[model samples]
Target: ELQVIQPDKSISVAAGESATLHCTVTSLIPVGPIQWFRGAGPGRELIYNQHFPRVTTVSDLTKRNNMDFSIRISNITPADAGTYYCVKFRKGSPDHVEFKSGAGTELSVR
Candidate 1:
């Protein structure tokens, strides 16, 4: 099931600015942490995880469910321009890999 939902939004920002890659997890079951990836496959870069320093996870504290898994990338660079993916990791899964992925958000840097 596609529990991970991301708007097909393109955000444009100049270098030194920031861009937020939005993601939401609507799974009824508990899932592990999420990882934000720029690009895909072997060429992809793991830009944000639970402890990635360069990226910030944004969620609304007022919401009880707290399903937001969005991430903000700071100090944008031209090289950072690409499609960002929100991948959820399933808990207790043997693979420990991406369980679900969103449609992807394209961030363009100038």
Candidate 2:
């Protein structure tokens, strides 16, 4: 199954600073691309995808316990103050096809 680990409830940063909205996943199946969203859910707007606002997962043996994914947003701006989430849409093997959303994290610019 696709498991998503949500990040912090709030992240405080400055206007000329940087922050990383963390998200992690766990699945031994076929996973498609990653989806990062804004607001309470993805229904609002897509903050990130497989492209921009890129994501990096730690798949090495050090953290194989589960799949880990994260994104770095530099130059924190007022407009960046919001909730961000990491999701995965995939068609895993039999009995494992579904959409999973990370617990999610919040962003607050100081």
Candidate 3:
């Protein structure tokens, strides 16, 4: 069973600003291969992987047994704005288990 949850309801930022997308999930199953995706109009788009920078693993005692992950986007542009998601999968698991689906955040350029 998969139980992932994000604590924040919404995140906002202006153009040229930078922010971190946070994700936390329950059950620390030592999963291998974590991925990040950007929510698009058609569907979710892959953003990062083992080769992507600005993506890192986060962990804290208060976050339960879930894994914490984040994506840091700098110099945010208009196109850089969109909903982001963090997905974690078990080493051999075929299905992806999303740890956090952060509330859709709208970014505006001024």
Candidate 4:
């Protein structure tokens, strides 16, 4: 079975602080590039694409399992309040074969 998990349903961050949106990708087969999106439905926007900036993937550089696909958003503000989704597509085809996504983690900025 394939699973994209965001264990923390809700994450609270103080304004000016950073927040980590936890996610884990587990699958029976090799997966494709991971992506992180902000908001929901029509208003949603892509925030991360296996890259870095203020938003970056929380990889396990410790050299254990790299299935941890969490993300970190820096310098939180009220405008950043929204739900974030962690997604994984099948290898070689992001435009057509997105296989799974996390339930989503709601971010509350205070």
Candidate 5:
């Protein structure tokens, strides 16, 4: 089963600053892909997905027996502010996808 585990649900930050989105997953055995999405309104929607070179930064914590992922946004802008979520995928198990806690960060521009 694919599962997303996050520490917090919401965060606040100031403009011209940077923030990190922490994402964790459990019971992952490889074979599928992981994706990230942003909540638009009542229903969550897709924002960005992990792609080659596009990944920019990623750390494999397999030794820790847990998947540790982080997305960093720099030089934040007003549009950069929103709710983000992580989704896990498994091979041949499209319906088994799991979503992490409703963790999101809010940014305010001055």
Candidate 6:
């Protein structure tokens, strides 16, 4: 079985503070660094990706482009508030892959 997980459904951050964002995956086969999207239906833009050498969406939490499933976003502001989604794509077969999305995380910056 393959699954993407966001353990915390919401995270509260104080204004001007930094926070750690996370997601995890369980796969039958080796897969990637997962993806992080902003807004709830993945409403807005992308914040992170799991591809090696990273497919380049980061544009953050030390965008190392490594295969890490976590992101450390810094500098919080009221404008930086929203619901986030953690996406996971897993390897199924040589010609197939599995995709999953986390429930959601609402980041409240106050």
> Superposing all C-alpha atoms, what RMSD in Å does each candidate have to the true structure?
2.5, 4.4, 4.6, 2.5, 4.2, 6.1
**Candidate 2 or 5, higher TM-score?**
2
| Backbone-clash count (model 1) | 0
The model with the greatest lDDT is: 4
Greater TM-score among 1 and 4 belongs to: 4
**Candidate 6 local lDDT, 1-110, one digit each (tens):** 65667777789999877756666556534554466778644247676653322223322334443333656677777876887787776546554343777877888997
How does residue 100 of candidate 3 score in lDDT? Answer: 31
lDDT digits (tens) for residues 59-109 of candidate 5: 654455547766665666677667777666655644545433435544344
- Total clashing pairs for each candidate: 0, 0, 1, 0, 0, 1
Candidates 1 and 5 compared: the better one by TM-score is 1
How big is the positional error of residue 64 in model 2, measured in Å on the Cα after superposition? 10
Clashing pairs in 4: none
Clashes of 6: 1
- In model 3, the worst 10-residue window by lDDT is 99-108
Give the least accurate 10-residue stretch of model 1, judged by summed lDDT: 57-66
Return the top candidate by TM-score: 4
- Between candidates 3 and 6, name the one with more favorable TM-score: 6
Which is superior by lDDT, 3 or 6? Answer: 6
| Worst ten in a row by lDDT for model 6 | 52-61
- At residue 57, what lDDT does model 1 achieve? 73
Point out the higher-scoring one by TM-score: 4 or 6.
4
TM-score of each: 0.83, 0.73, 0.63, 0.84, 0.63, 0.68
lDDT of 3 by residue, 19-54 (tens): 666665566765554566777445777777655554
lDDT of 1 at 27: 66
lDDT of 1 by residue, 32-83 (tens): 7678888877878888876666687787534556788888778889988888
